[PDB]
């Protein structure tokens, strides 16, 4: 039997298609937290970002003169 | 169809401006023809220039999808006034409000991209170094001639 | 302004046009529905304080800056049913609506497919081809000297006739084929 | 006060707008009355043959007739050479013709003069 | 060797079986889009084997299989080039055009002409693969007019309709001003090299390209809806929904950006033409985006979302980043074609209501459609791991982190956030809310056809990118060194638009009613582009095209 | 050539002993016979010409014209069949003389050796033209285009008989064959530039150049639908096939000579394909996309590369087969409504759907789809034009955009939209009718499989 | 991006401008400096048919991260470590990019102040 249209109220719904929605959000929920607990770093940064300033004039060749 | 409702030359006197407005069906009063320089309009009814997208949807036309009656006079360019052409509809904007609109954000926006290409961003690195000689034999240099040396150093 | 029967607009309408124009551009621009009634009964509240003006060249001078108001105040895209015209369904099913005579000019094989269909389709022709000449001279002895004045027809006055100018009206396509 | 709508060429004034649309005057109440008089005989006209059943054809047009006469057949018995129709004839007659023209030949002249003087790249050059 | 070019052929051969099917007809059809979609469905297993092993070795080849012509120096061959670009097009472009055929047996079946609009969609796939495979520009020609005949023929659908007429007569008009740079193109290379195909431009390598890549940037402008020639891909939204969904968001449209990405030797090699590519697609993704924040008709809407992502393509071309451009094509195609599938259900649920002003409350009426919502518009946005983010992020990780126009760089970043103000308006006014459409609810999703529809490209949607991008070999070097502000950029401009449009979305809610600002009247009306030279140049034709043309000089004069 | 000759005079004994239901079924037959016998024309060689006697030859350039003339016999015959049905017997007869004839004249003008003998059949076609447009017309209102026929003969034909008697005492001989090898560099004199125009304007009008085309949309819809089939198909391409004789020996004054000529066909393909966006007439819109493509052919004719002859010859192929459709088209909806207003029917898909696929195609090749063989002449032409000039290509570009814009605007204004009420004569599609659209169209896409045969002869 | 608003704002005469540099030559500062040594062989870098964008001096990490990605198939997801290993090499190349920039800045600082050393003493 189909859905029937009904009047100025909620309509119908199937047990199965309410399952599917919450099956497949969950599932992107899980993917984002799985992911985001494996990777971690294709959204905040994969290898540290050195401070220019903090370098001594050694290692780049500065004489002071 | 016969000659006495074809076009003709151009009306000068009131009584042939009479049978001109009967011939082509209309009021005498809104009949206006387009002004005799010699262009070779002829006689014919000079309306006033209105899109047929402008007409009334809901009226019962003759012909529905052109909003065109019959026997009603034409424009002159009833072909280039239909639906799927020129338009001559009001706006909610004003015509040159929207091409001052248009011609300031556009010359602006190429003004901006120029000043964009004057001074452009970058990162604070060196180039980016490659070994055999800047990739000498790589970029399609002769084997027969030898370039200078292009040696990078560490740090 | 362009109307069949009428040649013009009355006042009347003109004020309930309006009106009726300014609450859709209005629903268009208050998307919300108890918003948009609230703002509906404060905007009918605007329209009933000048109901009463018995001056028709002072209501005249208000409607005119009220369609001042209306066109400073209206949306650019305002909502359009989508099978009314400027929608995004309207006459799209046009290229659906075949013309009846178009019947007429089937083979006989196919016209055999449906046989109580078209034997129906000869008495409904048979009904329009003895209504015509009475309708013609229903109309012409009703129309005045010089034409008709409005664009409207009389209907069937005589017991056994038929409407004058019916057949395109009935037999019209469905606007679902 | 408000900003007054302007009217275009291609952007029209609407008729709620347009002050002549108000007008009440019995004149006015002739004109409009004559429209509707002729559109409604005209209307008449055309659905009696339209309606009829023993026409089987082309409901013929006069206006439609008239228009493509018009757009067709009408146009050199009313010409009259003077200096406006001299004038523009000459304008987008003999004008874009002479700019291509001297655009092309400029371009031409270039070209060869960097053929002939070795310049230009044809190395590759061998259909044309 | 003999496995990759056999099923290389058997996948266009199975695409054209039922054209000759459909042609060869006397029975009326035990369900013909069933059989379309059946070979569509075997094309696609059937493409997989090649893409599988080119992932496995890097296989690419070419089959110049027939000899057609020769004008005196150029043997114009039947030649098919399968490179990394085809081995991931073909296999995306047909699992899409399968999900948008089992769509279209659920929306478009009370079409009677439902095996006309197959052939076509089926033409269209034929014409869309011979583009994407071509080796010479002959073919590639062909296959760029066939793609723009039938956007022509299903745009126009509804022939009746003086709209959809009209919007196809447009869409021909921009793309043909794109043929002109495409045909200088071809021009040039035949003159200068002496060669339509692919692999001699290549090796012969010219440097004054500067002419010929002017001429693709021009046709990419008439393809992929750049602008200048864009307004005809928001006007294409009066064919079906189905249309809509395979061509002009997934499938036609990123063949200008494909056509620029088939030429990145040439490209690499000339900054001149990379900046153009970078200054057009920053426009484009910047007035696209923000006509986007104003409209009211959904399939406008994603219509503007395609084509800012089609700008940001021409962005990612224009840092000489093609091969991140592809796979945000190849990414790209999922989601939004599953946005227009769940917009337009939403559109045959309300009885053809498009408009998403009389929506709303349909989380809990629509409960699979407003997920696959939700779930095309985060991967639109670029949340964590979708598949929009193992591209479009990385875009920007490269649009930061390279010598790049800095004003195209900062109308980027306005896209990005004017991308989640736009989603999260279709989600404000179509899912949440209270309703607003009419009183006789007929919602209903519960086909197999719709669901399942929805559900493959769900799949793609989710791990399609994470798939993808762990199986392609690497052609650039990923610049992915940066401060952790830039690192950090794109997922906060997101987040900050996602901010200011609840902000705006909730001031909606209020009882109060404000004059309509000149920023909300320029970006309603469309930048006022397809108002004035939609207007203009027609007219300055037209009447030149009377009163001079004809009737001054080639009736009388002359 | 005379086993071509020969059977088409013997469909005059066919077509005048047939009885009075049998000489439409007759000459078809036999007529598509002589088609079929037609292919031995392509016995050509990549060095020499076929060469079949003193007064006829055949190279890569007459023989798909020949192909095209013998083939559009019989698709005449068959278009012209319905509106001759109340015709006189006798009448009937003299339609299908006069065609024969001008069948007759044209292939043994594509066949012409020497160049007296192909003015002689170049002019001699005229004629029966001519009294098949006067007499089979259906109105006539000539009132302007008598004076444009004087003007015809004056600036043209005698010009070019004048020069080619001068050819003839000074060569000594007007052999095509001979002339490959005696030719002379025509140098710049005032003397050789009269001749370069009495040798060129006749072909000028017979193309026709733009400002020179005051005829075409005349001739063509006062003309039965024969008339506009041979005129679109063959009657222009005389004028290239003579130019591309005739600039033989116009070298090398021609390279500045083609400098004016050259600028009124490629700013009036602008205007007339911008007319064709303008037109109220069908007919006239077919006639004013027939100056708008073969004012490419005087382009490519006037520059001289390979790669222009060989555009312009596919060209003038595929042009000849599309136009003639569009005309078929056109008057397989005015045998129905008896009107050529193109706004006055519309929305016929609604009502013929096979014969909107017809105006489809037609409409795809009209506009130069790939692969058809349009696209390859206007894409090769396109090719040495800009080989040419590299700016031309915004004046073919621009061209390739409104060649696009009436094509589909005749596409959408007579198949779509909405139908027109008043109109309840719209019959379904006659078998004739469908079979004369197949008939032009199956062979313009059999030849985008094999191109190389209308590539003329230096392929 | 502050260097940015140091070369546009302030001056550009102590930046290092982008396309032409190092200005200062590779000794300059460095006592016996030693050379960039590379690793895979150039014949071996032609056989594995690299992108010339990817034959820099830490190419020898890409050569076996292919081969570990041809080598694991379909296991697409075994060779997460060459990878690693690849992307931490690029990385200190890049580091060593940032180096020879803030070398070149700095030695610019140097230019600057001895300019001024000598115009405030000479
Ligand atoms: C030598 C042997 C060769 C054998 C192979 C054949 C080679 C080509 C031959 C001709 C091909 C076209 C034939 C059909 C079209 C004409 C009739 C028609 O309209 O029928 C509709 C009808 C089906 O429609 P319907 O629903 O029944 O009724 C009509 C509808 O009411 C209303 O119709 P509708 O709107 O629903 O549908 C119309 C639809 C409308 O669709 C379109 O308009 C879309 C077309 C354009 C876009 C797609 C194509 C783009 C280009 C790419 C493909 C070509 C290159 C591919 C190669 C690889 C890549 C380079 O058209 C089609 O579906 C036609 C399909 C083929 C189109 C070809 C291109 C036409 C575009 C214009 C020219 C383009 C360049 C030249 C192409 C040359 C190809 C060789 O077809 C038939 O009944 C078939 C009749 C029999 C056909 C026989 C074909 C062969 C004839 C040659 C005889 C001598 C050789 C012996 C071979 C015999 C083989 C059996
Ligand atoms: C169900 C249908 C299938 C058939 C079933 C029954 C037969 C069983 C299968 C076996 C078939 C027979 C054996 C194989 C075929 C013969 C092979 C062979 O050598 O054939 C000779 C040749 C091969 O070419 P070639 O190189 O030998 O010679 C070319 C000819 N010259 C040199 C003169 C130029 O022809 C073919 O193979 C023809 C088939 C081609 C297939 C593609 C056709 C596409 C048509 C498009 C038209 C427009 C093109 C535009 C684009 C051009 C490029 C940009
Ligand atoms: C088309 C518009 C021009 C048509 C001109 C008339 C036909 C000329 C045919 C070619 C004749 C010829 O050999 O010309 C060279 C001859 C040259 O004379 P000649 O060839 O006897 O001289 C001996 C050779 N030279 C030149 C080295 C001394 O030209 C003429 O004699 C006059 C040519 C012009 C004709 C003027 C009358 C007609 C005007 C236009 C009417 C249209
Ligand atoms: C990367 C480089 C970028 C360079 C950018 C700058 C160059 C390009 C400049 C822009 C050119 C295109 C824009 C102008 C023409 C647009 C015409 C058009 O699209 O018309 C659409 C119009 C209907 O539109 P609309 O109002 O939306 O209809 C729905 C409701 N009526 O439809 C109609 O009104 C029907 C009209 C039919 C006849 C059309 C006549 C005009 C033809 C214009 C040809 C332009 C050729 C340009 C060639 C350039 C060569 C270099
Ligand atoms: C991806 C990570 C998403 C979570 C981290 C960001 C959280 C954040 O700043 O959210 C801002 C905002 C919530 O704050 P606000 O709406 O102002 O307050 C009412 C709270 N329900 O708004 C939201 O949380 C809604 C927007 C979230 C965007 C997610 C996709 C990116
Ligand atoms: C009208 C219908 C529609 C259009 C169809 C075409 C009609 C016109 C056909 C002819 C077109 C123009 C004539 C051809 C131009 C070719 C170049 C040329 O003659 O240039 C002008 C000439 C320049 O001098 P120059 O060429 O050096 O003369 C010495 C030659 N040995 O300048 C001069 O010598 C000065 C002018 C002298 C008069 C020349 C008259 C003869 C040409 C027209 C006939
Ligand atoms: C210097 O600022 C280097 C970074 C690149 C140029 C500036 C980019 C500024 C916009 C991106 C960061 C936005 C953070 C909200």
């Known amino acids: ?65 | 169809i016969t000659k006495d409702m074809l076009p003709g030359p151009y009306p000068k006197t009131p009584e042939e401006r009479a049978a001109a407005a009967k011939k082509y069906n209309m009021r005498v009063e809104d009949y206006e023809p387009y002004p005799d320089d010699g262009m070779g309009y002829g006689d014919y009814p000079k309306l006033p220039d209105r899109s047929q997208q402008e007409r009334d949807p809901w009226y019962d036309w003759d012909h529905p999808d052109l909003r065109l009656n019959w026997g009603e006079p034409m424009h002159w360019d009833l072909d280039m006034y239909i639906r799927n052409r020129v338009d001559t509809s009001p706006t909610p904007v004003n015509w040159n409000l929207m091409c001052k609109h248009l011609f300031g954000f556009v010359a602006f926006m190429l003004f901006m991209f120029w000043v964009g290409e004057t001074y452009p961003t970058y990162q604070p690195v060196g180039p980016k170094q490659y070994p055999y000689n800047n990739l000498y034999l790589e970029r399609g240099g002769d084997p027969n001639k030898e370039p200078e040396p292009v040696v990078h150093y560490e740090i | ?177 | 006060s408000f900003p007054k709508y302007e009217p275009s060429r291609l952007a029209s004034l609407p008729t709620t707008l347009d002050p002549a649309e108000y007008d009440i005057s019995s004149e006015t109440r002739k004109a409009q009355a004559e429209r509707l008089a002729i559109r409604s005989r005209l209307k008449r006209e055309y659905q009696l043959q339209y309606n009829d059943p023993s026409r089987r054809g082309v409901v013929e047009d006069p206006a439609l007739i008239r228009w493509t006469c018009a757009r067709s057949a009408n146009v050199y018995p009313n010409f009259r050479p003077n200096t406006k129709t001299s004038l523009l004839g000459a304008l987008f007659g003999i004008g874009p013709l002479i700019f291509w023209y001297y655009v092309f030949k400029t371009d031409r002249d270039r070209k060869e003069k960097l053929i002939q003087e070795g310049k230009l790249d044809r190395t590759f050059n061998i259909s044309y | ?558 | ?459 | 991006g502050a260097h940015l608003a140091r070369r546009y704002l302030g001056d550009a005469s102590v930046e290092p401008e982008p396309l032409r540099m190092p200005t200062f030559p590779p000794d300059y500062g460095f006592p016996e400096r030693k050379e960039r040594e590379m690793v895979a062989t150039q014949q071996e870098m032609n056989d594995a048919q690299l992108v010339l964008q990817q034959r820099d001096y830490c190419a020898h990490y890409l050569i076996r991260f292919l081969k570990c990605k041809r080598d694991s198939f379909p296991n697409f997801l075994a060779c997460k470590h060459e990878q690693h290993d690849w992307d931490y090499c690029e990385h200190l190349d890049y580091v060593k990019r940032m180096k020879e920039f803030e070398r070149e800045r700095r030695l610019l600082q140097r230019k600057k102040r001895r300019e001024q050393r000598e115009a405030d003493m000479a």
């Open chain 5, 1 to 558: 060797m003999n496995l990759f070019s056999s099923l290389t052929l058997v996948t266009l051969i199975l695409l054209t079986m039922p054209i000759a099917a459909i042609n060869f007809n006397t029975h009326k059809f035990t369900n013909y889009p069933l059989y379309v979609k059946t070979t569509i469905s075997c094309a696609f297993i059937t493409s997989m084997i090649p893409t599988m092993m080119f992932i496995h070795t890097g296989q690419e080849m070419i089959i110049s299989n027939w000899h057609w012509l020769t004008i005196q120096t150029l043997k114009l061959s039947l030649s098919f080039k399968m490179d990394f670009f085809s081995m991931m097009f073909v296999p995306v472009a047909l699992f899409v055009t399968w999900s948008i055929m089992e769509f279209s047996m659920w929306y478009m079946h009370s079409d009677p002409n439902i095996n006309q609009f197959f052939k076509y969609l089926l033409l269209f796939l034929i014409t869309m693969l011979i583009l994407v495979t071509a080796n010479n520009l002959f073919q590639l020609f062909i296959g760029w007019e066939g793609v723009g005949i039938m956007s022509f023929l299903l745009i126009g659908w509804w022939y009746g309709r003086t709209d959809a007429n009209t919007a196809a007569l447009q869409a021909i008009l921009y793309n043909r001003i794109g043929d002109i740079g495409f045909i200088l193109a071809m021009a040039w290379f035949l003159i200068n090299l002496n060669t339509w195909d692919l692999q001699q431009i290549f090796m012969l390598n010219p440097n004054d390209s500067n002419l010929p890549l002017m001429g693709l940037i021009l046709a990419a402008t008439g393809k992929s809806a750049q602008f200048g020639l864009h307004p005809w891909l928001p006007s294409a939204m009066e064919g079906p929904t189905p249309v809509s969904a395979l061509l002009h968001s997934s499938t036609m449209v990123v063949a200008g950006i494909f056509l620029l990405i088939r030429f990145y030797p040439l490209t690499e090699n000339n900054k001149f033409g990379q900046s153009i590519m970078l200054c057009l697609g920053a426009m484009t993704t910047l007035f696209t985006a923000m006509c986007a924040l104003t409209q009211n008709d959904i399939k406008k809407i994603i219509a503007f979302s395609t084509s800012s992502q089609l700008g940001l393509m021409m962005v990612t071309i224009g840092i000489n980043q093609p091969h991140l451009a592809f796979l945000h094509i190849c990414t790209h195609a999922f989601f939004k074609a599953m946005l227009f599938m769940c917009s337009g259900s939403i559109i045959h649920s309300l009885n053809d209501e498009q408009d998403i002003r009389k929506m709303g409350g349909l989380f809990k009426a629509m409960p699979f459609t407003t997920t696959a919502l939700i779930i095309g518009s985060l991967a639109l946005t670029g949340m964590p791991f979708l598949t929009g983010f193992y591209s479009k992020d990385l875009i920007i990780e490269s649009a930061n982190t390279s010598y790049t126009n800095a004003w195209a760089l900062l109308m980027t970043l306005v896209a990005t956030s004017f991308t989640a103000i736009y989603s999260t308006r279709i989600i404000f006014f179509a899912l949440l809310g209270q309703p607003r459409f009419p009183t006789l609810i007929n919602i209903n999703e519960n086909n197999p056809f719709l669901i399942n529809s929805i559900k493959r490209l769900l799949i793609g949607s989710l791990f399609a990118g994470f798939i993808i991008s762990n199986n392609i070999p690497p052609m650039t070097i990923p610049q992915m060194t940066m401060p952790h502000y830039l690192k950090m950029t794109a997922l906060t401009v997101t987040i900050l638009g996602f901010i200011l449009a609840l902000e705006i979305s909730n001031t909606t809610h209020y009882l109060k009613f404000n004059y309509p600002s000149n920023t909300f009247k320029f970006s309603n009306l469309l930048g006022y582009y397809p108002t004035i030279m939609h207007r203009l140049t027609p007219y300055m034709n037209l009447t030149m095209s009377q009163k001079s043309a004809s009737s001054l000089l080639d009736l009388i004069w002359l």
């Open chain 1, 1 to 65: 039997a189909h859905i029937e249209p009904r009047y100025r109220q909620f309509p119908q719904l199937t047990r199965s298609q309410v399952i599917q929605a919450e099956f497949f959000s969950a599932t992107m929920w899980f993917w984002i937290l799985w992911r985001f607990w494996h990777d971690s770093d294709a959204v905040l940064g994969h290898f540290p970002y050195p401070d220019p300033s903090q370098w001594t004039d050694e290692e780049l060749g500065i004489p002071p003169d």
């Open chain 3, 1 to 177: 302004a362009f109307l069949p029967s009428a040649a013009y607009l009355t006042h009347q309408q003109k004020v309930l046009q309006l009106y009726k124009r300014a609450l859709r551009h209005l629903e268009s621009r208050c998307v919300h529905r108890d918003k948009y009634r609230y703002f509906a009964c404060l905007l009918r509240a605007r329209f009933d304080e000048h109901k009463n003006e018995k001056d028709m060249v002072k209501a005249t001078q208000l409607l005119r800056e009220a369609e001042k108001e209306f066109w400073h105040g209206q949306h650019p895209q305002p909502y359009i049913f989508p099978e009314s015209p400027g929608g995004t369904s309207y006459e799209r099913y046009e290229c659906y609506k075949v013309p009846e005579w178009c019947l007429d000019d089937w083979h006989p094989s196919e016209k055999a497919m449906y046989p109580d269909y078209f034997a129906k389709r000869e008495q409904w022709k048979k009904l329009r081809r003895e209504s015509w000449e009475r309708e013609v001279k229903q109309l012409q002895e009703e129309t005045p000297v010089g034409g008709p004045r409005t664009e409207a027809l009389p209907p069937a006055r005589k017991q056994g006739d038929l409407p004058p100018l019916w057949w395109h009206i009935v037999t019209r396509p469905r606007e679902r084929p």
């Open chain 6, 1 to 459: 050539m005379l086993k071509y000759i020969i059977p088409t005079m013997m469909l005059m004994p066919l077509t005048w002993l047939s009885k009075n239901s049998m000489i439409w079924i007759n000459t078809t037959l036999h007529s598509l016979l002589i088609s079929l016998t037609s292919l031995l024309l392509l016995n050509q060689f990549g060095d020499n010409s076929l060469n079949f006697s003193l007064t006829f030859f055949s190279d890569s350039l007459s023989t798909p014209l020949l192909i095209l003339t013998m083939w559009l016999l019989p698709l005449m015959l068959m278009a012209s069949q319905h509106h001759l049905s109340k015709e006189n017997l006798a009448r009937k007869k003299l339609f299908i003389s006069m065609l024969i004839l001008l069948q007759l004249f044209l292939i043994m003008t594509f066949t012409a050796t020497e160049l007296i003998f192909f003015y002689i059949m170049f002019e001699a076609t005229l004629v029966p033209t001519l009294i098949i447009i006067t007499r089979w017309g259906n109105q006539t209102e000539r009132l302007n285009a008598g004076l444009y026929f004087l003007f015809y003969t004056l600036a043209g034909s005698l010009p070019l008989l004048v020069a080619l008697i001068y050819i003839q005492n000074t060569m000594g001989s007007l052999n095509f064959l001979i002339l490959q090898y005696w030719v002379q560099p025509m140098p710049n004199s005032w003397s050789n530039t009269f001749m370069w125009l009495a040798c060129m304007m006749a072909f000028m009008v017979k193309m026709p150049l733009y400002g020179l085309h005051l005829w075409l949309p005349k001739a063509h819809v006062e003309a039965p639908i024969a008339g506009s089939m041979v005129l679109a198909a063959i009657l222009l391409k005389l004028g290239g096939y003579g130019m591309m004789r005739i600039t033989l020996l116009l070298n090398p004054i021609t390279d500045f000579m083609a400098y004016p000529f050259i600028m009124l066909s490629l700013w009036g393909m602008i205007m007339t394909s911008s007319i064709c966006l303008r037109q109220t007439d069908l007919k006239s819109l077919i006639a004013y996309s027939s100056v708008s493509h073969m004012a490419l052919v005087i382009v490519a004719i006037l520059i001289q590369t390979p790669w222009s002859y060989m555009g312009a010859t596919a060209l003038m192929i595929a042009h000849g087969l599309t136009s003639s459709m569009l005309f078929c088209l056109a008057n397989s909806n005015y045998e129905r409504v008896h009107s050529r207003t193109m706004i006055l029917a519309r929305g016929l898909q609604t009502l013929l759907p096979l014969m909107a696929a017809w105006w489809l195609l037609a409409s795809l090749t009209n506009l130069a789809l790939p692969p058809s063989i349009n696209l390859i002449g206007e894409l090769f032409v396109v090719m040495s034009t800009f080989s040419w000039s590299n700016i031309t290509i915004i004046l073919m570009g621009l061209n390739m955009v409104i060649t696009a814009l009436y094509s589909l605007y005749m596409l959408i204004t007579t198949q779509r939209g909405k139908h027109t009420h008043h109109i309840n004569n719209i019959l379904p599609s006659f078998t004739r009718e469908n079979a004369l659209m197949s008939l032009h169209m199956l062979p313009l896409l059999l030849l985008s499989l094999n191109p190389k045969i209308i590539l003329g002869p230096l392929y």
